[PDB]
């Protein structure tokens, strides 16, 4: 029997799109190879340095109850995005922010947006469809160091310990990780592989293990699923599968054009990182053959396939899918009922 | 024990009207197929989203006492309604939001309301005497995918699989529904019939397991006892006799209008959630034949029955009767007694 | 469930420097053999004195959480390198000053702060190695005496009560200090040797126990790795180094130069709590010999190892890591979380 | 006598600039053909309905002075733009704004924004002269209703009534316009050509009163010097002209990158205002033939020149000098002084 | 007659310092070639932006009387430099800042401010005598071209205007400027020569005009009484001039050492504004030759008469001279009274 509050239409649209905002702004910061670092503070002692998105996320929450509802509904997609693969959160949220504000937009007394929800779900097994099949799988010890190194921001190093564990104890064995009070990174086995992380700080090695376990949650994924082209051209490719699709009505229209729409945010998030203008770099990734995207950490455009920036299939699949079906059932909105601050 | 507000007539009356019109749109907005969701705050964790009128009226209430006393009495509509059907708790919140309107619009200082409730209870009855009359038989079991897909907001899958499971378990069995960890629905027997809902989130899955529910609700409410036709037409072809009603004094012939301008309120309701204005439509509704209707998803008039648009009696029936039985008793207040804030 | 408020950028920056500022003077106005004092009120009793960087640093907690930031993680370098090395905490303090500075100071748009921080860790990782070859191993108990004074603030006393312990102990023996109830320094051993620290007070004995641990801690640290040019000058004669790097891209180039830049801040602050300008000390030195360097106590440009002005290598190779490792990290960050002030 | 407030470096840069683009903004959402009206709050009787760049930036003040500061300089630019030309203050503010925020953007320790605003003065003499190169004198009347069509945002009537005024009086002739008291636009020649406006109310008189002083005054600066490409694509094609530019040294170099983004502004903002992106508009215009640019009513690249949009060379190039000079000089603040609020 | 507040020493000298060195830091901001300019609010219009240091200096109170008395001490100085010599406002502002700073800090319970006053002026007097005795008379309209340049923030054109105009209405001829209409300045004569600044707002004409305001008095001081080294080197010279004094007493000793340490500050500031460091540099230009000064336009030594960077000896002398008369004189406090604010 507690006091409610209650909000109609745009009002509460707006109030929930404020809180989305923030909270992905705050995520999106800390994508790509350019992406910059959050610093959160901790009530028992240090701040913790996390470039990891998910963790942006679940520690960012807003004093308004309205916003606070989007809040924790991007929350939600990016714990659900780390609970089924362990990497993408920030691609998940980026999306997520992207398919809601397009859905928010698009709303009018003659919009259903029940079948504009639909029309995305649609658009997304179409565009899931696409990625399987233009996904190869893993064949080379190689490609498990490649996709190490650019899961763990670069870190040539990272990768190569874990394609070195890979080979020793199999790509099924298991690996954990853990803290290592040295100054460097060694493995040991005693089987089952160790990694033991080194650094000067505690800030820093928690850092370096949250990268470490990202690398080996994608290259984990890697292994089941296969791999994509990386730097979000594996979207930008998928992007026509679109256009062959012949929507019921108008409202599945409306869907799939948002949802090809927001296809488009990694790759410009990741060149707008790299401190350039995403959306000419998004069209010349599109101009080019699909085996050409844009080299972000050299800032000029590269074969991607040879250069060894590829991302799992699982990580992309499992973002997309989170994305879309909490954002397009929030755009189903209409009423948000929040308890009055006591 | 404790101080206490009385207010007299009038303005006691407005005040209650007021919380019952807040809750009363609150609920209606989630009204047919066109119908939109709405979002509730959770204190424990992330927030609901749901497109049932049961749980967004019970998860409303207002400091001002005055105001609550109508959101109780209407949430009790809700939740009788639901107890006894399981489905049509929104058209029964709008039915009584219709009916207290109505009473506290007709009351003068010669108006009996006693005796206004003796006549508007005689014509529910009336009512509900035509509505069993005009009822159907159900006999094949796709008539049980046309209720299940009409009571999931135009789901076809939802339907499907409650039909084969209706047809494997038994009509008469048991059904239970549990939340599946997958993103597909899946019905497996073991015998009791199960259905695993499936989805990438808890709020989807909490969302469809809601119309899963209400699906099973309806078709077992169909088999019970039949089908009448959908989209609000029962009460809006049991609307021409009352006229063949007589009442005793004036306050019944005030109560006896009071449910023949009710009965308009669930096909205007249905109307305008599609964005069009609905007195048209009802007009055009009782113009036309006793088989067609407004087809509220594709927006034209269509023969209810052969587009499977159909709905069960017991729903209909329950939902008015327990909105007048509440809204009617509402109608007779004068003196209202509150207690002082704390 | 707490609410938390997110700032972005350059803001957010500035309000970290000032706290990372305000503690890193509080802990700068020490060092030196002309250094001052810290008064830091104890709620239990008698306050304490102390010329000790951690203890400084350990006491000094901001209100404004962004402020708060910065103490934390310039506590955290302060800490860690008085647990790794028992001394120069002050020193990894004003290096960590300066290397978030200067790296703050470098954010552009264009900038990539994640390669910057890769520069660091080179020019620190090429600065050490350079640091290791200088170091020279000790030989006699005078250089022992000599550690020990320079350690305990010029205290003479101090340094020959050290070298005659580690002389009847040996230099690889267990020693270890307590406060002496009666007027002055007396060393008992019994085995193992134990040190009283005399004086008149409890304030005194405490300042005088953590000098002689200083002393200790450094003594130790020189016969296990080796001895350096004192007052700075290590860093200095190591600024070589780094002009004969050649980085890769533009933000390498930037970290370098942060790190060349920082490596004269010892000397400056040496200088500076002397009263004296500390650029033109540091620069005097650049020019003369490599055995040459200022004597802050008499004022005088002297040979540090003849004058016995001398510092362990571990010492300074420790407190060089930690501020280089917890600064540079600090350096990448854009946005902050921090929690509302309930 | 009066006590005053005082702000040093970014904060103060950060706080001008904030109020600079809030009155950019509020002049911008009016550019182009497809820019919508501003509403202006009047106290003497009804509010004013406005399209006009220097009036809407003259009505933008704000309550913190620092702030006021900008917007006041802002409204120089504007008012400056409209005094020499009459038209194109629109394209002054952006221009400005644009400068203006490239000018904070590059500022640090060792920058000189003094001889930045040189070397952004140099690349404005440099467009200039190019401007004056490539401009194409008037020769025909169609030319002259071409650039008052275009310069009262597409109204063909309002371009044919001054063709006709200025065929009948001549080139060089007076003509003035004059409030309208009917429905209809009338010339009459009582010598010196009159126009009467044709409105339903005052405020829409007003608001073709200012649309018909812009075409005039564009049909004046037309016949003065010239007319180059409509639509921004002048300064676009003119882009090429600063890459055979030597700067003195990086200042200058500073300075002509900051115009050769900026050159890009102004075709942006008329894409933008079109409802679709800018980047990739204006990267397709410089791309494409040189003869060829941007419709923003049709949508489409075709001929600029054969489809009449042409501007004045004299408005460009003074909403370019104007908006340069001064927004370069506002880069050159370091400290600002204001009075404190009594 | 109002009720006053009376503050007793160290207090107050503090409270004094701290205004004194808030407009001495918002002066010297500006100072140098590589200086910035300074934007000060205006209540009757558009705000104005300056690069001179005796506007800055008038336009800025401080809401605290105890500050604001040695505010308007400061201003006092520059007021009196602009007055007698109508350049080198800054210079003075920062030698009277070193002044009052190191007579501020250099008294004690046995120290006598009269006699450190007194010795302040014998400093003074010499310093003033070994100019005099340094100075080259100017004999070449070239060198009036130089100065007139270097005064204007190293415009040539604005230099050679001036010389031009000198040439042809004698060097001893009058010479006004009035802001032109145009966009660049002319110079006419009908004899009295009329200097019609150019520009393209009020805001940059303004500036202008008082950059070849201060050029015009320079080049009249130049002429009057002769040129010395600029960029404060000549007062790094008459140093030695200083240590042939033998003091009467300790206290003249004392106010001999504040003007020696105060004679390097115009240097310092200028190297400061340049991004370098400045002890190191102004060390650099003692060391050096007597004709070497430090060129902080190209970042280089130079022989600097050579290269033109010229300052007027009458104008370095009276800037002098006001900054110590005033400055001397304001050490010599020991109580201050104020009025209480109402
Ligand atoms: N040098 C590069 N050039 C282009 N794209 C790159 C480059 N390095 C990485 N990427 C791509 O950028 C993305 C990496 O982003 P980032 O690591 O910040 O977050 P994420 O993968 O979405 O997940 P999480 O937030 O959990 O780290 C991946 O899509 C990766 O393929
Ligand atoms: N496609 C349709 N066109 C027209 N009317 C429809 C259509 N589908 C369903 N209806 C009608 O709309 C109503 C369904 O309303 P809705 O699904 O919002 O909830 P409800 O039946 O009132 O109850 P509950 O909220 O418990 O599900 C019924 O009267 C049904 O007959
Ligand atoms: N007499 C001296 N002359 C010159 N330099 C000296 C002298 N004594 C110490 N130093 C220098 O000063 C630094 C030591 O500073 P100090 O003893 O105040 O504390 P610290 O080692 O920085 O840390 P902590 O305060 O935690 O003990 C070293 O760089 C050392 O070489
Ligand atoms: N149909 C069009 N296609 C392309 N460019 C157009 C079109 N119509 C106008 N423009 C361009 O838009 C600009 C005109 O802007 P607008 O009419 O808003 O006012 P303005 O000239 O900027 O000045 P003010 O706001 O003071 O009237 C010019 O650069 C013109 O070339
Ligand atoms: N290019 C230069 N190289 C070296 N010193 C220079 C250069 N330009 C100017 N200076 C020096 O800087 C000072 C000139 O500063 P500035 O013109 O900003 O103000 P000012 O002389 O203090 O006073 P005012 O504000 O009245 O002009 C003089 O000491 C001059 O010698
Ligand atoms: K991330
Ligand atoms: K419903
Ligand atoms: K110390
Ligand atoms: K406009
Ligand atoms: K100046
Ligand atoms: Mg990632
Ligand atoms: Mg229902
Ligand atoms: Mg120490
Ligand atoms: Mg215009
Ligand atoms: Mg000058």
């Known amino acids: 029997g507690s006091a409610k509050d209650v909000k109609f239409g745009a009002d509460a649209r707006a109030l929930m799109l404020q809180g989305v905002d923030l909270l992905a702004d705050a995520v999106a910061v800390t994508m790509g190879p350019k992406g910059r670092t959050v610093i959160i503070e901790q009530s028992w002692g240090s701040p913790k340095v996390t470039k990891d998105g998910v963790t942006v996320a679940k520690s960012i929450d807003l004093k308004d109850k309205y916003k606070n509802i989007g809040a924790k509904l991007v929350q939600d997609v990016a714990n659900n995005t780390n609970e089924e693969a362990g990497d993408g959160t920030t691609t998940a949220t980026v999306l997520a922010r992207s398919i809601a504000k397009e859905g928010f937009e698009k709303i009018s007394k003659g919009a259903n947006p029940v079948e504009i929800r639909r029309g995305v779900m649609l658009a997304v097994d179409a565009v899931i469809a696409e990625l399987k099949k233009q996904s190869k799988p893993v064949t080379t010890p190689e490609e498990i160091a490649q996709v ?183 755009t189903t909105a209409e009423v948000v009922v929040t308890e009055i601050p006591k």
């Open 148 to 330: 190490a190194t650019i899961s763990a921001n670069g870190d040539k190093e990272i990768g190569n310990i874990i394609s070195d564990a890979m080979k020793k104890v199999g790509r099924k064995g298991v690996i954990t990780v853990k803290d290592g009070k040295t100054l460097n990174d060694e493995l040991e086995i005693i089987g089952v592989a160790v990694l033991k992380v080194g650094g000067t700080s505690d800030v820093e090695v928690n850092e370096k293990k949250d990268r470490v376990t990202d690398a080996l949650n994608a290259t984990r994924a890697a292994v089941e699923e296969g791999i994509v082209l990386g730097g979000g051209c594996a979207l930008l490719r998928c992007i026509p599968a679109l256009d062959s699709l012949t929507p019921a009505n108008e409202d599945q229209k409306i869907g799939i054009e948002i949802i090809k729409r927001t296809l488009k945010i990694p790759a410009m998030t990741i060149a707008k990182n790299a401190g350039v203008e995403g959306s000419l770099i998004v069209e010349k990734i599109m101009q080019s053959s699909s085996e050409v995207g844009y080299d972000a950490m050299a800032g000029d455009f590269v074969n991607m396939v040879e250069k060894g920036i590829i991302d799992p299939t699982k990580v992309v699949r499992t973002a997309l899918l989170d994305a879309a079906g909490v954002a397009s059932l929030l």
